Design a protein around this ligand. Structure first.
Ligand code: 135
Lengths: 245, 13
């Protein structure tokens, strides 16, 4: 996240950190995700597409730091890895960029609630906040586009939803943005999601609940003027979500 | 009653 503040998992208890094992000994961060129900985490297909080997990923819940442990964290293996079949990537956009991970611990259970592990709510069919709404994003992604390392402390920031009319202006993204995407930016193009933040949540208050309104998907550069962050529009994937969980 | 019921989506404690 470019800008923002450092935070702790208690402020985003549904955030899930996904890593990949290289039996050579290292475990590297891949993407973020969100806990939907005890056994299901939702993220973005583009984080897995290149290596759909579920057995090589590890998912942690209740984590405030990237490579050190947090007291209360839970470790899970990926029992099922569901990618969208109509996922497609083009020069910038990722289409149908949503994925589901069914988790299981070594004891054979799913997540349990704690002050650091909670689920986030899903929107009602095709129901979104109106543009102008401030939503927050969280993640362990880059703090500057030129960095080649990820921060060790979790970060969060606030961005506002913008209209499709504004985002589809030729000098923003044109027709690369579809009705199945949402754009969110900082009025002053100072804070934004960036590389490493994919798969994580765009949370807004909708009908009185903190709802998973979007999943970090793509963007040109990070915090660039007229280049908003683009998110998968969760409200338009509810049937898909329901069919598999 | 079972742990799962304690989940309350969207609530920060
Ligand atoms: N400007 C933004 N809001 C933005 C830009 C890039 C990414 N992410 C990536 O490009 C990316 C690519 C591969 C793997 C993970 C990523 O986060 C996420 C957000």
């Amino acid at each position: 996240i470019i800008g923002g503040e450092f935070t702790t998992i208690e402020n985003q208890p549904w955030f899930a950190a996904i890593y990949r094992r290289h039996r050579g000994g290292s475990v590297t961060y891949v993407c973020g995700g969100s806990l939907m129900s005890p056994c299901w985490v939702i993220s973005a297909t583009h984080c897995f597409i290149d290596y759909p080997k579920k057995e090589d990923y590890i998912v942690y819940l209740g984590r405030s730091r990237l490579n050190s442990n947090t007291q209360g964290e839970m470790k899970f293996e990926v029992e099922n890895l569901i990618l969208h079949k109509d996922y497609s990537a083009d020069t910038l956009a990722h289409h149908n960029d949503i994925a589901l991970l069914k988790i299981r611990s070594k004891e054979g259970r799913c997540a349990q609630p704690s002050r650091t592990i909670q689920t986030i709510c899903l929107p009602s069919m095709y129901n979104d906040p109106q543009f102008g709404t401030s939503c927050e994003i969280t993640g362990f992604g880059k703090e500057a586009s030129t960095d080649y390392l990820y921060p060790e402390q979790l970060k969060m920031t606030v961005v506002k939803l913008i209209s499709h009319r504004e985002c589809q202006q030729p000098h923003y993204y044109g027709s690369e943005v579809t009705t199945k995407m949402l754009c969110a930016a900082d009025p002053q193009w100072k804070t934004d999601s960036c590389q490493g933040d994919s798969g994580g949540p765009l949370v807004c208050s909708l009908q009185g609940r903190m709802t998973l309104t979007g999943i970090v998907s793509w963007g040109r550069g990070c915090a660039l003027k007229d280049k908003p962050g683009v998110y998968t529009r969760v409200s338009h994937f509810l049937p898909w979500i329901r069919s598999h969980t | 009653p079972p742990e799962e019921l304690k989940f309350q989506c969207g609530q920060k404690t």
